[PDB]
Symmetry: C2
Subunit: 182 residues, 2 copies
């Protein structure tokens, strides 16, 4: 919340637990399935229907997790991706997840990123982005991706950030439709 | 911290955020923002600062600076800190919430693609920049892939855009940062 000497975004209990419990999820769908559990927990904790987590790309070690905390956190920048990337950087002691000596990091996200989070992914040093719900799915429940540049996926790829989309899309869409209805 | 994202502010930036201040003219607002750039460079930060003001009264709401490298946080651009600190102070994620004064972000340089999106989501209704994108790309910063006519994109959303305000002073500070950012000791820095 508001502090004179910091920007401070608190985490709800499920998300503190996510960021402190040891967890290694080797398979891509295992990583996304866990991210989807975080989506449902986040909704129960008064946040938006979006979650993300940074994993070591090869082992599947969970480094950090984030969810949308925009309304309860009074912070429009508190998208899942921003929280996950920033909490991973804090844990690993560097702004640059591609720094020498760090293993390759991947951001596994419940939905394709908005233009803000597209920029955050570029600056973060992650080497891979894996998304479930597509941009059109997000827009079709009333969330705005904003004016991304033309060929934003190619923009990531040109910078050495691989992009995969549609992973457990149907499961992510079940949670999004449930949210929208409620 | 195990239970929060926590971006500490250096003492000068705490001082900036604590003291009531009213700056009416655009040049007055930007002059203050550029003071924060110089203080930030002296505190190991990047040569960037920004502040949210009440657009029509000049009251300072919050200030932010680039704390990316010392704060170990690639999202800790000046604009993200200023907008987020203003939201925390005003107790809302939306700086255009009903009842709030129209807010303006005054920033030392044109925003990168991340901060461009943050400006859209923030609720500010005016963006005022000093250094141009080409100025910052010339000292090795990257603005990243913004959409074509990003300025027009802001304007269409009812966010006015002004750029080049006190550009010469902002350029002088960028060149200063560039001359002092290396490893060989230079006592003049
Ligand atoms: Na791909
Ligand atoms: Zn986003
Ligand atoms: Zn930026």
């Amino acid at each position: 919340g508001h502090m004179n000497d910091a920007l401070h975004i608190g985490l709800p209990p499920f998300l503190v637990q996510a960021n402190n419990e040891p967890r290694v999820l080797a398979a891509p769908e295992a990583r996304m399935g866990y991210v989807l559990e975080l989506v449902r927990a986040n909704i129960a904790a008064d946040g938006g229907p979006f979650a993300a987590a940074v994993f070591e790309r090869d082992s599947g070690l969970l480094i950090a997790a984030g969810t949308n905390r925009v309304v309860p956190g009074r912070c429009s920048a508190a998208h899942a991706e921003i929280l996950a990337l920033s909490l991973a950087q804090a844990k690993l002691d560097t702004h640059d997840l591609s720094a020498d000596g760090l293993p390759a990091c991947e951001l596994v996200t419940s939905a394709e990123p908005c233009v803000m989070c597209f920029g955050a992914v570029i600056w973060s040093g992650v080497r891979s982005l894996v998304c479930a719900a597509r941009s059109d799915d997000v827009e079709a429940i009333g969330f705005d991706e904003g004016p991304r540049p033309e060929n934003w996926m190619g923009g990531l790829e040109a910078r050495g950030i691989t992009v995969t989309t549609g992973l457990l899309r149907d499961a992510a869409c079940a949670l999004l439709r449930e949210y929208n209805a409620c």
